[PDB]
Design an enzyme around this catalytic site. Structure first.
Site, PDB file in Angstrom:
ATOM      1  CG  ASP A 114      -1.951   1.188   1.262  1.00  0.00           C
ATOM      2  OD1 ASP A 114      -2.996   0.922   0.321  1.00  0.00           O
ATOM      3  OD2 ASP A 114      -1.774   1.928   1.827  1.00  0.00           O
ATOM      4  CB  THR A 121      -2.748   5.118  -2.037  1.00  0.00           C
ATOM      5  OG1 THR A 121      -3.960   4.423  -1.537  1.00  0.00           O
ATOM      6  CG2 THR A 121      -2.186   5.967  -1.089  1.00  0.00           C
ATOM      7  CB  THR A 122       0.839   3.598  -5.946  1.00  0.00           C
ATOM      8  OG1 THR A 122      -0.077   2.634  -6.382  1.00  0.00           O
ATOM      9  CG2 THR A 122       1.493   3.075  -4.597  1.00  0.00           C
ATOM     10  CG  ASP A 150      -6.262  -1.108  -0.186  1.00  0.00           C
ATOM     11  OD1 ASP A 150      -6.411  -0.215   0.957  1.00  0.00           O
ATOM     12  OD2 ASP A 150      -5.189  -0.954  -0.692  1.00  0.00           O
TER      13      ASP A 150
HETATM   14  N1  LIG Z   1      -5.766  -7.792 -13.647  1.00  0.00           N
HETATM   15  C1  LIG Z   1      -5.186  -6.645 -13.826  1.00  0.00           C
HETATM   16  N2  LIG Z   1      -4.975  -6.508 -15.058  1.00  0.00           N
HETATM   17  C2  LIG Z   1      -4.358  -5.457 -15.416  1.00  0.00           C
HETATM   18  N3  LIG Z   1      -4.219  -4.251 -14.801  1.00  0.00           N
HETATM   19  C3  LIG Z   1      -4.570  -4.252 -13.441  1.00  0.00           C
HETATM   20  C4  LIG Z   1      -5.034  -5.305 -12.981  1.00  0.00           C
HETATM   21  N4  LIG Z   1      -5.377  -5.375 -11.708  1.00  0.00           N
HETATM   22  C5  LIG Z   1      -5.096  -4.042 -11.466  1.00  0.00           C
HETATM   23  N5  LIG Z   1      -4.687  -3.454 -12.334  1.00  0.00           N
HETATM   24  C6  LIG Z   1      -4.048  -1.953 -12.485  1.00  0.00           C
HETATM   25  O1  LIG Z   1      -3.127  -1.961 -11.700  1.00  0.00           O
HETATM   26  C7  LIG Z   1      -2.879  -0.620 -11.181  1.00  0.00           C
HETATM   27  C8  LIG Z   1      -2.082  -0.328  -9.853  1.00  0.00           C
HETATM   28  O2  LIG Z   1      -3.348  -0.427  -8.753  1.00  0.00           O
HETATM   29  P1  LIG Z   1      -2.726  -0.929  -7.279  1.00  0.00           P
HETATM   30  O3  LIG Z   1      -1.275  -0.058  -7.288  1.00  0.00           O
HETATM   31  O4  LIG Z   1      -2.900  -2.120  -6.700  1.00  0.00           O
HETATM   32  O5  LIG Z   1      -3.628   0.439  -6.605  1.00  0.00           O
HETATM   33  P2  LIG Z   1      -2.925   1.363  -5.576  1.00  0.00           P
HETATM   34  O6  LIG Z   1      -2.411   2.343  -6.270  1.00  0.00           O
HETATM   35  O7  LIG Z   1      -4.159   1.781  -4.732  1.00  0.00           O
HETATM   36  O8  LIG Z   1      -1.851   0.384  -4.890  1.00  0.00           O
HETATM   37  C9  LIG Z   1      -4.356  -0.022 -11.393  1.00  0.00           C
HETATM   38  O9  LIG Z   1      -4.434   1.351 -11.886  1.00  0.00           O
HETATM   39  C10 LIG Z   1      -5.071  -0.946 -12.101  1.00  0.00           C
HETATM   40  O10 LIG Z   1      -5.903  -0.341 -13.195  1.00  0.00           O
HETATM   41 MG   LIG Z   2      -5.398  -0.513  -5.606  1.00  0.00          MG
END
Ligand SMILES: Nc1ncnc2c1ncn2[C@@H]1O[C@H](COP(=O)(O)OP(=O)(O)O)[C@@H](O)[C@H]1O
Ligand SMILES: [Mg+2]
Ligand SMILES: Nc1ncnc2c1ncn2[C@@H]1O[C@H](COP(=O)(O)OP(=O)(O)O)[C@@H](O)[C@H]1O
Ligand SMILES: Nc1ncnc2c1ncn2[C@@H]1O[C@H](COP(=O)(O)OP(=O)(O)O)[C@@H](O)[C@H]1O
Ligand SMILES: [Mg+2]
Ligand SMILES: [Mg+2]
Ligand SMILES: [Mg+2]
Ligand SMILES: [Mg+2]
Lengths: 528, 98, 155, 526, 95, 532
Positions: free
Chosen positions: F54, F87-88, F391
């Site tokens: 996170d 958040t990232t 989350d």
């Molecule tokens: N199964 C998937 N296939 C392709 N892209 C994905 C998948 N799951 C999540 N993503 C993408 O990865 C990106 C990173 O999300 P994440 O970093 O987990 O959220 P946060 O920024 O809250 O930590 C998101 O913008 C999402 O669009």
């Molecule tokens: Mg996420």
């Protein structure tokens, strides 16, 4: 990471590897380029650098500024080295090389962050640079009739263009004409040691003069020198490498006598040796005597009694220039002083220049050398004047070698960028992005010109791009009118080899920097 | 292969991809690595090219020997197997000339 | 703005460009011009009280305690222990005037200080310093021609 | 002018170096206790920082006594602690398995395979491991005492208590069986609270036994009290039997001559009233978690009652469970049901140079004490650890009656099953699947290495045997280093222990494979 | 101190060398149990070896408690419960 | 001349320094984006270890000195508070926006024009997202919630475990559903008590159809299981009665001391008897219970739990229908307790979880609550599971509240970049450049996603941009808006078909917050750092 009780490399070794170190190298190159940005163009500014000893160097030359900087970054030293290379091979463009290399790296940095393979970028740089050099050679303007008047005009215009960025740019026409006149008198090799540079404090820039001969500072006159006449109207100059003093015949020589008659004979023999050398010099008909070795007070008084001029301890370069101007030969022995080995000048005179005594050899009709006497209000003032004149001299020599000129003010780079973009729009697309980045990076110099002059860079760049696209090759930045104009018709002329070398060196530096993926720094030895 | 900027103890840059040059400009302190470096330098002196091949092959052989020792083989048996395989490879190599 | 740029990279790795860069200083842009103009103004204002028949001497003391009382501007600036580079430039200007002419070594410093003082308020209004230098050169040419015009010959 | 983004002491490391360091740290943590597995294991002496000495071969204790700086090592220590807490056995096995899986994962990480693929392969492999372990299990009749004793023996053959196997097995089985409880439809064992282990240095180990009751290091408050009662009626209390101050500020104001004497007499009368309320139930023993006044002692002895004071709350709860009593705080609310009848003998006897209280003839006691006699404190501590392992294994068997072959037979069977299943994957993740399947061979390999036989030949023979049709119970004899059948040798272990070990090892590998960046040195910022 | 910290989490046992922080204090006055509460010295114990020996955690605990300096002592959770603390929007029904 | 006691940075120096700080913060967490992202393991220099992905947790744990970087850290914290996901992404987007804006400024573009262009681009991007890139969840059903939860839990320690964890999270969220006034279904997350305990695998995590208490009974004599529970929630300690500061006992007749001392405890005894006379079986109090009242409850065969957390007690009372009673006092001046104050549950059990025990209140009547018991291998993995579960719960809450979702895998970013690059040509001359740079900056998310998978980022993003350009130009091929990035194989893929969804509020709030952060940092051209 683990302790590894027996470590592999020596303790203190620092290693950086991967994309972050490449990005750091690019940033270091940007930092180095930023230090010399404002020195480019007629609206450029000088930089002052103080060393540890307290001495200050004031220079508009990119190579000098980079050298005075104590750069220790391994990737940043490449920019300094290519600036030195450009200075050595061409003599001008030492700032353009650094700006171009840094702009190449800046343009390709976002692709580096995306994980693009460095070899692709290197290949794209090589292809783009080869095409650009070919285009420069193709569109460079030369005239194949080679008359003296137009050659003189081209040399003077190139010298003025190379000079219109330094503190002597107000007197750029005067200095360029004088530099071209000095260069045209060199015989076949255009040796820089055959052009003297004398810096005399005090006096305006317009007081600086070029001697159609040789002139050097007075060298430690002995007693009786002030009785020698200081002007001759057809002197014959005896160039010697001889010590005219009462001294031991040899270092290992030893005299063994056992009678007072032999003692007196030995003393008279030493005196007669000296007087025989002096008489052999005098009977040659020469009136001016210059020696590389010290000339004693006895010889000085002897020459004064004969209404003759003497000057000992003359430096090597001054004697060489005197030989090349008057047309004699340096003699280590005075036993055969024929008219062949004797120099000749129309007028010799010792005058005062700002609190210094200088000996002048003028009126030489077949001289193959020249001497610059530069006047200024400060030491660094004259030093930077000398640097600017050296840049102009190098440009004029290169123009003598080949009169292939291109219009400056960023016009040539705008033409190259347009050509490279047109080429890049007709390829698959992986190399297209990199070649387009190269073409965009080629726009740094006109943008830097506008920024230094205080213009609005974006509007000028847009106008230049539109004008080049719609037709026009030599349209560049017009500094005076804050607009664009035909730089070829404005006589902003540059030798083509300057831009050729600049592009080649910048491309090679960028490829070398990109090719490195890991940097290793061994621990220091003998830190003390 | 990518060039490496190696700085020795005298502030001298060495940007190159020559394995022997990189090894000689590196302050190697581990004595087994010293043996492998001397082997690479001997290869450079005798032939002139292949130092990276020597180092890579020696490293791979040593990792696989570590694996074999872990699974239960003795050092002498691994050494004998490597010697026999090296002899077989030297026998095979002339037949691969194109 | 001062000491240069200290970033230590955007990845946390060390970022060393120039040897002993943490111990070095740097003045960038217009503030450098302001400092130089201020130093030259200080030197010129010090010199200006020793100009003319009613000028007053400066009483110089060297590193050994030897005392020199003089009105010669070149001598005063030569014996003055300065550290600022622009002050050294002013001293060199006085020495140059002494070498070329031998008189008027105090007027040059006052004139240069006044020129830079005017250039300060010209810069504050948004004029490139190169433009100021070019205008000064043009006016100097005009003044030189006027002197040549109004000059008189003596036997 | 130290302008910075992060703090000065912040250190950041990332890339292949972090993964290699984590895997090497886990490998070395495994190597610390690799040699302490199997019936032929060796003792290890641990020098406690507080001057004590811990001599043991239990993986959890050895790993707990070690302080480490690398966070991966801390993760491995936490894994060992979790395995010990959940089931009480298999700490060394789970540590070794985690190390081996991390090794085979590093092998792939050296190539260009992303850790997510390895983690997915590990999860699929773990699912298949659980399925195969459930498949090859066998049921157990818990009512068969011989089977339970054999299971406990197989659990304790690898510990120093193996020299006295029948005695330890009987002690553990009796303690677990008699601590078993069922109330309100809820079943519990509760080895942690009841079934206390009390160790008294001296004597001989063969004298150790589990009492049909409790035993505390307490003596009678007054020497006139009886030290031997045939069928005591025990009453347990928490409130003190002495005059204490009230909760509120209760200053008195004496202005008469006889008020002071009256106040003291009423203090005595309150003590007498409390003692009379206690006596009304006609008990024989009174136990209190707090002090008993001397006047209370006199009033209790007047009624021929033995009183013991200042007993720990856990000890009082154990006594209540053993003798069927209820702890009461107010003597005026003492009911007949609260009187503890069921203890068959109470006896205070001196062991060495210290009095001990025995309530050791209770009928149907739900709590017990394990009295250990040994050579010294460290030997008795190791014996107590082994007894804890035995009781945990017995509880696991009672709660879950499946068994799994030991001696590495289960490891080889599951490895062969996963290897056979991997033949139809036809994907990119089949290689990590097969690698983590074959990583289970580290258990028979470690057993053979500790035994001292030839590792390569024995593993090859065992694999060839396991390629046959009914050979899932073929493992390695830990003493003779020969291939035997565990339906003949009899080494069987609870399915729960193997399941927990496998799950914990695979999930530790998954957790450690996920990290690729390390930042440290920052303030706690609490 | 390590043993005492287990049963007294409120206390903030910390160690620091004399070199980083006099000569007479370094030669024969190293063992000092500096007790700081409220920013001022409450316990200024030195030469503790004489009244302790060369002693387990019980001796130090008793020595500190006899002067009323050790805070009064006060179960094992699974691992943790809390995750946050704010206006968590507790349950409602509304009809 | 200023004579200010401090350091001053002006012009390009301070702007470059701020951009360096923002880029460094972005690069800290850029490696933990997307399913091919990897976690980080933090050490608190006292041995404490935190393994997490996170962004908010990483940025809060780190100590940051530069204030422009503190801006991004607190931006991530704000994004976590107001949304719970992305958040990232917001930090990365803000840093890229700042970098490109600084490039524009260094190209002698005035910062005001850049800020105006950024504002216009953000407004138009939000409008385009709302009008073209939203999918209603009404026609999808529970599959939409499951897919959103799975997408949220990707890049987390419960990734492959998603097939089970998504069902668990959806059931937990739907259990606590309630409707307030105006008939708006509001889902009150953070009411799902998350309890962690190492032990069995993640598959063994249990979702409680009731409430789970991290506390045990106060006395071993009390039963550990009550079938038909009558929960009595109290907010006062059950101890011996002690008079307040304003009341003082002074005795002149010695005969009253015994009566005083007896009443001191008889008051509490009478209170306990009054509480128990209504048939109460489980008694929960936020305060403490002494041994006397514990024995009272033991004799009655009833539960008694002390030191219950206030939030847990409130949730239990709301679920079971009980009423919190800080005191026993009716409006008649008396002291009584009635059965109407009793909550009910189908079972109350003290269960054992890995050598430790906790209380389960199963099947509360008149309201349904939920709790989750997370089983892991150690403390760190349990903490990471808790963070990822929070989350996922926040994502499900956002999806159920606002019924609009957007395609994942960077499809929205590519569509926005194409649309804004097309749109910039219709506004201004320099704000045109600002909007173009905003569009280019929006491409950082798919680039990072591709890079983290060790895929050819340039080719993949070029193909994605080509697909979205074809979708925007051709009005008969608008189904390509859902084409995103499939990082498993490194190919463009219809993410809406593949079931990769995110709440629209995540994208909207991230864009707005990143735009404000970039504008705030870009307004600075001078810094004065006073010496402390
Ligand atoms: N199964 C998937 N296939 C392709 N892209 C994905 C998948 N799951 C999540 N993503 C993408 O990865 C990106 C990173 O999300 P994440 O970093 O987990 O959220 P946060 O920024 O809250 O930590 C998101 O913008 C999402 O669009
Ligand atoms: Mg996420
Ligand atoms: N009169 C002019 N008008 C426009 N541009 C000029 C003029 N004179 C020189 N330049 C430009 O200045 C640049 C070189 O600057 P200068 O400092 O003289 O040499 P260097 O390349 O070593 O920095 C050339 O690219 C040229 O185009
Ligand atoms: N008599 C035996 N013969 C062969 N193997 C045995 C025997 N007894 C136990 N083992 C093996 O030894 C292992 C138990 O080792 P142990 O020291 O108990 O480790 P841990 O304490 O981690 O459980 C089990 O995997 C079992 O298969
Ligand atoms: Mg030039
Ligand atoms: Mg080679
Ligand atoms: Mg005068
Ligand atoms: Mg065991």
């Amino acid at each position: 990471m683990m302790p590894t009780p027996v470590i592999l490399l020596k303790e203190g070794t620092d290693s950086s590897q991967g994309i972050p170190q490449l990005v750091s190298n690019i940033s270091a190159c940007q930092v180095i380029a930023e230090a010399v940005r404002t020195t480019l163009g007629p609206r450029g500014m000088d930089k002052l650098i103080v060393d540890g000893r307290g001495k200050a160097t004031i220079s508009n030359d990119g190579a000098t500024i980079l050298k005075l900087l104590d750069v220790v970054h391994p990737a940043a030293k490449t920019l300094v080295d290519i600036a030195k290379s450009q200075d050595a091979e061409v003599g001008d463009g030492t700032t353009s090389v650094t700006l171009l290399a840094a702009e190449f790296l800046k343009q390709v940095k976002p692709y580096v962050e995306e994980g693009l393979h460095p070899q692709i970028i290197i290949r794209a740089f090589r292809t783009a640079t080869q095409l650009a050099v070919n285009k420069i050679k193709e569109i460079a303007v030369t005239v194949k009739k080679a008359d003296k008047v137009e050659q003189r005009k081209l040399l003077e215009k190139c010298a003025m263009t190379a000079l219109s960025s330094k503190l002597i740019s107000q007197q750029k026409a005067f200095f360029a004409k004088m530099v071209v006149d000095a260069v045209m008198m060199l015989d076949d090799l255009l040796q820089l040691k055959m052009i003297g540079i004398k810096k005399v404090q005090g006096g305006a820039l317009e007081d600086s003069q070029l001697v159609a001969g040789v002139a050097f500072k007075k060298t430690f006159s002995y007693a009786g020198f002030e009785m020698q006449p200081k002007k001759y109207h057809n002197p014959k100059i005896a160039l010697l490498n001889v010590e005219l003093e009462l001294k031991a015949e040899k270092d290992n020589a030893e005299i063994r006598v056992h009678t007072v008659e032999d003692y007196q004979a030995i003393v008279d023999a030493e005196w007669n040796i000296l007087y025989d050398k002096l008489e052999k010099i005098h009977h040659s008909g020469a009136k001016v005597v210059l020696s590389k070795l010290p000339i004693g007070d006895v010889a000085t008084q002897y020459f004064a009694d004969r209404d003759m001029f003497c000057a000992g301890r003359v430096p090597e370069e001054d004697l060489k220039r005197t030989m090349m101007a008057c047309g004699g030969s340096i003699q280590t022995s005075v036993n055969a002083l024929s008219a062949d080995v004797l120099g000749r000048c129309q007028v010799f005179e010792e005058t005062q220049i700002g609190g210094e005594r200088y000996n002048f050899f003028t009126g030489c009709p077949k001289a193959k050398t020249c001497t610059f006497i530069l006047r200024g209000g400060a030491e660094q003032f004259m030093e930077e004047t000398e640097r600017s004149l050296h840049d102009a001299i190098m440009i004029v020599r290169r123009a003598i070698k080949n009169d292939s000129v291109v219009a400056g003010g960023g016009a040539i780079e705008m033409e190259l960028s347009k050509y490279l973009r047109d080429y890049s729009r007709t390829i698959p697309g992986k190399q297209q992005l990199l070649i387009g980045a190269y073409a965009k990076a080629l726009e740094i110099i006109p943008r830097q010109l506008c920024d230094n002059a205080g213009f609005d860079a974006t509007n000028i760049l847009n106008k230049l791009r539109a004008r080049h696209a719609q037709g026009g090759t030599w349209y560049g930045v017009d500094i005076n009118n804050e607009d664009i104009a035909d730089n070829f018709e404005a006589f902003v002329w540059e030798p083509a080899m300057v831009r050729i070398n600049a592009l080649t060196a910048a491309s090679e530096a960028a490829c070398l920097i990109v090719s490195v993926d890991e940097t290793i720094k061994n621990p220091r030895s003998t830190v003390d | 292969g990518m060039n490496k900027m190696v700085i020795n103890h005298l502030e001298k840059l060495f940007v190159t991809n020559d394995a022997a040059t990189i090894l000689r400009e590196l302050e190697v302190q581990h004595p087994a690595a010293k043996m492998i470096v001397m082997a690479s330098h001997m290869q450079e002196q005798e032939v002139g090219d292949g130092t990276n091949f020597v180092l890579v092959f020696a490293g791979a052989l040593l990792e696989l020997a570590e694996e074999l020792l872990r699974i239960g083989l003795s050092v002498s048996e691994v050494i004998e197997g490597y010697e026999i395989a090296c002899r077989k490879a030297h026998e095979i190599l002339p037949n691969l000339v194109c | 703005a001062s000491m240069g740029t200290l970033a230590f990279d955007e990845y946390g790795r060390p970022f060393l460009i120039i040897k002993d860069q943490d111990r070095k200083s740097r003045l960038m842009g217009l503030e450098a011009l302001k400092s130089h103009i201020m130093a030259a103004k200080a030197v010129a204002n010090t010199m200006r009280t020793s100009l003319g028949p009613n000028g007053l001497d400066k009483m110089m003391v060297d590193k050994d305690g030897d005392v020199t009382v003089t009105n010669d501007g070149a001598t005063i600036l030569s014996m003055m222990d300065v550290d600022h580079q622009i002050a050294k430039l002013m001293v060199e200007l006085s020495k140059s005037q002494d070498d070329e002419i031998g008189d008027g070594t105090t007027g040059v410093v006052v004139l240069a200080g006044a020129l830079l003082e005017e250039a300060e308020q010209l810069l504050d209004r948004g004029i490139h310093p190169i433009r100021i230098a070019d205008g000064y050169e043009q006016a100097a040419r005009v003044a030189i021609e006027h002197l040549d015009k109004i000059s008189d010959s003596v036997l | 002018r130290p302008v910075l983004v992060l703090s000065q002491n912040t250190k950041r490391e990332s890339g292949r170096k972090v993964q290699s360091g984590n895997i090497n740290a886990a490998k070395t943590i495994a190597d610390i206790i690799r040699t302490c597995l199997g019936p032929k294991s060796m003792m290890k002496m641990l020098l406690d920082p507080m001057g004590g000495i811990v001599m043991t071969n239990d993986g959890n204790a050895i790993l707990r006594e070690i302080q480490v700086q690398h966070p991966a090592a801390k993760s491995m220590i936490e894994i060992s602690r979790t395995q010990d807490e959940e089931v009480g056995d298999g700490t060394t096995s789970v540590i070794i398995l985690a190390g081996e899986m991390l090794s085979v994962a590093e092998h792939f990480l050296e190539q260009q395979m992303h850790p997510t693929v390895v983690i997915s392969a590990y999860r699929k492999a773990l699912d298949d491991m659980i399925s195969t372990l459930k498949k090859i299990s066998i049921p157990v009749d818990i009512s068969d005492s011989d089977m339970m004793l054999n299971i406990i023996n197989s659990s304790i053959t690898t510990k120093a208590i193996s020299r006295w196997s029948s005695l330890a097995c009987n002690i553990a089985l009796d303690a677990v069986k008699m601590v078993q409880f069922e109330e309100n439809g809820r079943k519990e064992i509760d080895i942690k609270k009841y079934a206390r282990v009390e160790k008294i240095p001296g004597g001989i180990i063969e004298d150790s036994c589990v009492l049909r009751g409790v035993m505390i290091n307490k003596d009678v408050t007054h020497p006139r009290m009886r030290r031997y009662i045939k069928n005591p009626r025990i009453v347990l209390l928490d409130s003190s039997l002495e005059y204490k101050k009230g909760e509120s500020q209760t200053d008195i104001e004496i202005t008469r001559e006889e008020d002071f004497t009256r106040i003291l007499q009423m203090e005595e009368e309150y003590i007498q009233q409390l003692c009379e309320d206690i006596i009304q139930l006609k008990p024989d023993v009174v136990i209190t978690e707090k002090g008993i006044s001397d006047l209370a002692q006199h009033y209790l002895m007047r009624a021929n009652i033995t009183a013991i004071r200042r007993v720990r709350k856990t000890d009082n709860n154990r006594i209540a469970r053993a003798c069927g009593a209820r702890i009461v705080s107010r003597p005026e609310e003492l009911r007949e049901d609260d009187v503890g009848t069921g203890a068959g003998l109470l006896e205070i006897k001196k062991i060495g140079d210290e009095y001990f209280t025995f309530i050791t003839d209770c009928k149907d006691p739900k709590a017990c004490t394990i009295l250990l006699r040994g050579a010294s404190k460290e030997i008795l501590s190791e014996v107590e650890r082994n007894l804890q392992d035995a009781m945990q294994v017995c509880r696991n068997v009672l709660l879950d009656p499946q068994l799994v072959p030991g001696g590495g037979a289960s490891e080889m069977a599951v490895a062969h099953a996963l290897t056979e299943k991997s033949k139809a994957m036809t994907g990119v993740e089949q290689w990590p699947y097969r690698a983590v399947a074959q990583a289970l061979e580290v258990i028979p390999r470690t057993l053979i290495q500790n035994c001292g036989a030839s590792t390569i030949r024995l593993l090859t023979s065992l694999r060839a045997k396991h390629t046959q049709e009914n050979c899932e119970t073929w493992g390695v004899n830990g003493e003779t280093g020969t291939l035997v059948d565990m339906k003949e040798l009899g080494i069987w272990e609870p399915l729960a222990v193997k399941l927990q070990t496998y799950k914990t090892a695979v999930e530790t590998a998954v957790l450690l494979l996920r990290i690729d960046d390390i930042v440290s040195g920052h303030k706690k910022k609490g | 101190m390590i043993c005492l910290a287990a049963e007294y989490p409120a206390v903030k046992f910390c160690k620091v060398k004399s070199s980083v922080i006099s000569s007479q204090f370094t030669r024969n006055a190293l063992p000092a149990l500096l007790i700081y509460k409220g920013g001022e010295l409450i316990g200024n114990f030195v030469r503790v070896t004489d009244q302790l020996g060369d002693f387990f955690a019980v001796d130090l605990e008793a020595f500190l408690q006899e002067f009323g300096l050790l805070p009064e002592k006060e179960v094992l959770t699974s691992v943790r419960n809390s995750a946050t603390c704010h206006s968590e929007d507790s349950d409602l029904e509304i009809d | 001349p200023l004579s200010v006691f401090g350091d001053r940075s002006t012009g390009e120096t301070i702007r470059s320094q701020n951009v360096m700080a923002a880029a460094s913060i972005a690069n800290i967490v850029k490696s933990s984006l997307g399913p091919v992202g990897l976690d980080k393991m933090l050490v608190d220099d006292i041995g404490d270890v935190t393994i997490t992905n996170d962004g908010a947790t990483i940025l809060k744990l780190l100590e940051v000195e530069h204030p422009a970087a503190k801006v991004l850290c607190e931006l991530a914290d704000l994004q976590d508070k107001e949304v719970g996901d992305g958040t990232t992404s917001v930090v990365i987007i803000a840093a890229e926006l700042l970098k490109n804006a600084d490039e524009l400024v260094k190209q002698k573009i005035h910062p005001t024009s850049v800020i105006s262009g950024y504002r216009l681009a953000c407004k138009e991007a939000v409008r385009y997202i709302n009008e073209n890139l939203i999918v209603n969840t009404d026609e999808l059903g529970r599959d939409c919630l499951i897919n959103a939860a799975k997408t949220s839990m990707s890049s987390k320690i419960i990734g492959i475990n998603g097939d089970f964890f998504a069902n668990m999270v959806v059931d937990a969220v739907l259990a606590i559903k309630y409707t307030d006034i105006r008939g708006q279904p509001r889902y009150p997350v953070n009411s799902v008590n998350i309890l962690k305990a190492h032990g069995r695998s993640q598959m063994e995590s249990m979702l409680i159809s009731g409430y789970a208490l991290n506390c045990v009974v106060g006395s071993q004599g009390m039963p550990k299981r009550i079938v038909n529970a009558k929960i009595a929630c109290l907010d006062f300690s059950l101890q011996k009665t002690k008079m307040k500061l304003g009341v003082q006992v002074v005795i002149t007749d010695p005969e009253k001391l015994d009566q005083i001392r007896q009443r001191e405890s008889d008051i509490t005894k009478e209170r306990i008897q009054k509480i128990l006379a209504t048939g109460a079986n489980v008694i929960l109090t936020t305060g403490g219970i002494d041994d006397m009242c514990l024995k009272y409850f033991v004799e009655a065969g009833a539960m008694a739990v002390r030191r219950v957390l206030k939030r847990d007690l409130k949730r239990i009372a709301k679920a079971s229908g009980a009423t919190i009673l800080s005191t026993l006092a009716n409006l008649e001046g008396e002291e009584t307790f009635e059965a109407a104050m009793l909550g009910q549950a189908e079972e109350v059990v003290q269960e054992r979880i890995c050598d430790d025990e906790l209380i389960l209140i199963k099947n509360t009547k008149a309201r349904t609550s939920a709790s989750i018991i997370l089983r892991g291998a150690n403390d760190f993995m349990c903490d990471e599971m808790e963070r990822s579960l929070h989350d996922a719960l926040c994502v499900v809450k956002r999806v159920l509240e606002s019924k609009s979702v957007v395609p994942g895998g960077g499809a929205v970013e590519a569509a926005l970049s194409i649309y804004l690059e097309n749109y910039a040509t219709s506004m201004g001359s320099r704000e045109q450049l600002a909007i173009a740079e905003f569009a280019r900056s929006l491409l950082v998310i798919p680039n990072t996603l591709a890079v983290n998978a060790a895929q050819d980022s340039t080719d993949l993003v070029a193909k994605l941009r080509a697909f979205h350009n074809e979708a925007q130009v051709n009005p008969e091929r608008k189904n390509l808006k859902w084409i995103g990035l499939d990082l498993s194989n490194g190919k463009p893929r219809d993410n809406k078909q593949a079931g990769v969804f995110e709440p629209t509020i995540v994208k909207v709030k991230s864009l707005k917050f990143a735009t404000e952060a970039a504008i705030t940092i870009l307004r600075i051209d001078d810094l004065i750092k006073l010496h402390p």
